[PDB]
Paper text:
C-terminal binding proteins (CtBPs) are cotranscriptional factors that play key roles in cell fate. [name] and CtBP2 regulate cellular processes through binding transcription factors and recruiting chromatin remodeling enzymes such as histone deacetylases, methyl transferases, and demethylases to targeted promoters. Although assembly of [name] has primarily been considered in terms of dimers, there is accumulating evidence that NAD(H) binding triggers the assembly of two [name] dimers to form tetrameric dimers of dimers. Our crystal structures of [name] with AMP reveal participation of the adenosine phosphate in the tetrameric interface, pinpointing its central role in NAD(H)-linked assembly.
As discussed in Experimental procedures, careful purification of [name] (28–375) in the presence of 5 mM AMP was required to completely remove bound NAD(H) that is apparently acquired during expression in E. coli. Eventual success became clear from crystallographic analysis showing the electron density for AMP but no observable density for the remainder of the NAD(H) cofactor. The cocrystal structure of AMP bound to [name] (28–375) confirms that AMP binds nearly identically to the AMP portion of NADH. Our finding that AMP triggers tetramer formation, but adenosine interferes with NADH-linked tetrameric assembly, demonstrates that this phosphate is critical for tetramer formation, apparently by localizing Arg 184 for favorable hydrogen bonding across the interface. The conformation of Trp 318 is essentially identical in [name] bound to NAD+ and AMP lacking the nicotinamide moiety, arguing against the hypothesis that a direct interaction between the nicotinamide and Trp 318 is key for NAD(H) triggered assembly of [name]. In the 120s hinge, Ser 124 contacts NADH and Ala 122 makes contacts in the tetrameric interface, and thus this hinge region is in a critical position to both sense binding in the coenzyme pocket and contribute to tetrameric assembly. Rather, our evidence indicates that it is the interaction of the adenosine phosphate with Arg 184/190 that is the key moiety triggering tetrameric assembly upon NAD(H) binding.
Numbering used by the authors:
A (entry chain A), B (entry chain A): 26 to 357
């Protein structure tokens, strides 16, 4: 027989099968949890493809009796315990480049939607607001601000963060970034200003946008304490991970006006609902259903790449043949 | 007594009066038409301040018995018959620089809102759509496209058009422009590609954005004929003037899918209403209530400048003391 590969949290495998036809039997589970995965896959699955809707703990990982490779169809892999996965002898890889510029463009659109209130002006138009006089335009568009001279604070100057910084400079933004893992001099190469502490970033930025990965040290990076270190009436953008922000702390900040507005493509609990969660009655809120990454070309691009990574793992040597394995440190 | 200056289509004159206190008696009419302007102003008004909500024809102009200067608090002056105004000996000026980058930023936000469907994804979230699976994200975000490699066609490479072009290049856009009034070589200075005809612009652009002024030769520039010259599934953005687009021709294009989406901050008839007009049932439509220009700094900036232009006209020599008079050609 052929090695079994399973799409854990999905149903469509059309893009991947031309690549995996002669190398593995491909099945799907469409499961939000390992509860919903039939034991046939748990016992025989050699490879696994998954997105961001199912999380795998050590307990989940130990239920797979033959799994050897997990390929995350996407850039983020915070939903996988790569540390223990490596312990159990399971390599974990991702697809980091497919949606970089897509995410940066959706970030800039969210930033612009806060400064220009375009989305809010649109919603007010569908709700029947009549804007006839100049005074009424200033009123319903109240809060719209000039961008040139504003300081954009970038938290995490990675691949998406850099694309965000380059675009932000074209609008007159003065871009700052805080990245405690980058080597010395990265700011000189890109003509940006850097800060040492997260408090310095928040203290100087008129609008803060998150572009870091969710790791064991930055959970609730934006919390009730760090939120008090932001400028009065600042902006918050988050297309990275919902686990980075304490929504209850953010909710109160929006209600009291300490944060003038927030744009969020990710949330602590997804799918996101305006009726449930700490943001139920939070004002000045724009939210997208975790779609900052999605383009037709990016969706196909990352699915074909992940399929090839799976192929390399089955016909090559782990983890040397892999291209984007992220847990070679912990892989026994 | 002092020379009378009147804010025709407005009520607030706080910003302007510190500048005009010792030079003119300032009053307001809050009138949508010359019908609503009391004859006291029609007879004695020497200067006039107006926005874009009241239009002045030759008939309207001839009702002013002492008017000598009209200052449009804004960049556009298509709502004034400057030709006949000059005939009647009435100089007309504008404020062209206050909201250039504001308008370009709102343009880019509208462009990004079409490519990224951010505004539409937000509205769908408030309406209760549950986006839990990857397949559902591709579905509700259907239509979102990659920007790099896309060709943005700019119609009118003026002050706002240039700011739009510079920003568009930072996103990977390949920017084209059509401006039959610019001198030879303007494309070389800014590193852009130029086209001779409006049909060439529409034939090559994936997304067309209007940045021209409404003049006697470009009314309904986007009409049923020129609309058929655009690419299949193209984008339309308009933060210039609603009179440039034939909304009935655009309405059918959106319904048939010939245009995938349209973002409009101006309309043929304002204030805009989703229940009235040729766009009543037009799909894939984003609209803002003519607010692409507005910032707090731009609003104050253009009102103080216009007040100073009025001052220069009253204490100086017309039209030599004026800074931004646009009808010196026709001014007798
Ligand atoms: N807690 C944190 N604060 C700021 N930056 C971070 C943090 N954790 C990770 N990063 C950075 O975020 C960037 C992510 O890049 P990428 O993986 O290409 O999206 C890397 O440069 C990391 O060093
Ligand atoms: N019908 C038209 N088609 C294309 N460009 C135009 C048209 N009419 C005017 N323009 C240009 O639009 C620009 C407006 O610049 P500004 O007045 O600075 O916004 C000028 O460069 C004009 O030459
Ligand atoms: Ca501010
Ligand atoms: Ca297209
Ligand atoms: Cl402002
Ligand atoms: Cl796809
Ligand atoms: Cl695409
Ligand atoms: Cl104001």
């Amino acid at each position: 027989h052929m090695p079994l590969v399973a799409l854990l949290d999905g149903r469509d495998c059309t893009v991947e099968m031309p690549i995996l036809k002669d190398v593995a039997t491909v099945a799907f589970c469409d499961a939000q949890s390992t509860q919903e995965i039939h034991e046939k896959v748990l016992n025989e699955a050699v490879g696994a493809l998954m997105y961001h809707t199912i999380t795998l703990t050590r307990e989940d990982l130990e239920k797979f009796k033959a799994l050897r490779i997990i390929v995350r169809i996407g850039s983020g892999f915070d939903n996988i315990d790569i540390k223990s996965a490596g312990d159990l002898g399971i390599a974990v890889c991702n697809v980091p480049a497919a949606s970089v510029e897509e995410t940066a463009d959706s970030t800039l659109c969210h930033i612009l939607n806060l400064y220009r209130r375009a989305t809010w002006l649109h919603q007010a138009l569908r709700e029947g607001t009549r804007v006839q006089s100049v005074e009424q335009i200033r009123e319903v568009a109240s809060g719209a601000a000039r961008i040139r001279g504003e300081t954009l604070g970038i938290i995490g100057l990675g691949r998406v963060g850099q694309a965000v910084a380059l675009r932000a400079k074209a609008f007159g933004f003065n871009v700052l970034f805080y990245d405690p893992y980058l080597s010395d001099g990265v700011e000189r190469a890109l003509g940006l200003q850097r800060v040492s502490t997260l408090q310095d970033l928040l203290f100087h930025s008129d609008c803060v946008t998150l572009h870091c990965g969710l790791n064991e040290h930055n959970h609730h990076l934006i919390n009730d304490f760090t939120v008090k270190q932001m400028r009065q009436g600042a902006f918050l953008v988050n297309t990275a991970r919902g686990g980075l922000v304490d929504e209850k702390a953010l909710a109160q900040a929006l209600k009291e006006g300490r944060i003038r507005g927030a744009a969020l493509d990710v949330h602590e609990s997804e799918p996101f609902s305006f009726s449930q969660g700490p943001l139920k009655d939070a004002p000045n809120l724009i939210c997208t259903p975790h779609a900052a990454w999605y383009s037709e070309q990016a969706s196909i691009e990352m699915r074909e790449e992940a399929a090839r990574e799976i192929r390399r793992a089955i016909t090559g040597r782990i983890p040397d043949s892999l291209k984007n394995c992220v847990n070679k440190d912990h892989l026994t």
